[PDB]
Symmetry: none
Subunit: 106 residues, 2 copies
């Protein structure tokens, strides 16, 4: 799997159910006009392949403003991390090293 093929969240209950069902979760909150989000796509694809025990999903902040708001996202990309049924942390910006460190620690 890759950035292009992962689930794109569209609904708040859907988001809440994913969090509950997944013992390791990464959510890429991005915007389509935002360049650093595009830059992070190849990095995310690599992390998706490298971490098969982590579920990676994505969310367009402009298409799903309720979900972005729930996670207080106003800078993009924001990577939201969940562990054992709850959200635990956030990595803000196109920081591939910080993102891998967070994912590795899940």
């Amino acid at each position: 799997s890759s950035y292009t093929s992962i689930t794109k969240l569209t609904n708040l209950t859907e988001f809440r159910n994913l969090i509950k069902q997944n013992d390791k979760l990464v959510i890429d909150f991005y915007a389509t006009w935002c360049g650093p989000c595009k830059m992070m796509q190849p990095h995310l694809t690599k992390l998706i392949q490298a971490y098969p025990d982590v579920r990676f999903v994505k969310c367009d902040v402009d298409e799903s403003p309720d979900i972005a708001k729930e996670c207080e996202v106003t800078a993009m990309p924001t990577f939201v991390l969940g562990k054992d049924g709850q959200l635990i942390g956030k990595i803000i910006g196109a920081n591939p090293t910080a993102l891998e460190k967070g994912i590795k620690d899940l």
Copy 2:
């Protein structure tokens, strides 16, 4: 009072002066989407009532990223403890036992 009623820090002037004004202080740095933060709320309410000589306040790290940066907050929740008008230390994570021990030492 309770987690819901305690002062919420919304600017740096307020943050700095309230520290200076209080001889025993707990700042709960939290995020609204953060599961461990939510978990700690009932614990904080019990600690607030058990330690009426200690001022508890709270700060939303997404709403007030400047204050969070001033305390170099990374993990959610982070409790920053103050004694005699200055900050002295942190308790990191949803650890009620460790938080209560720190408060008892104030």
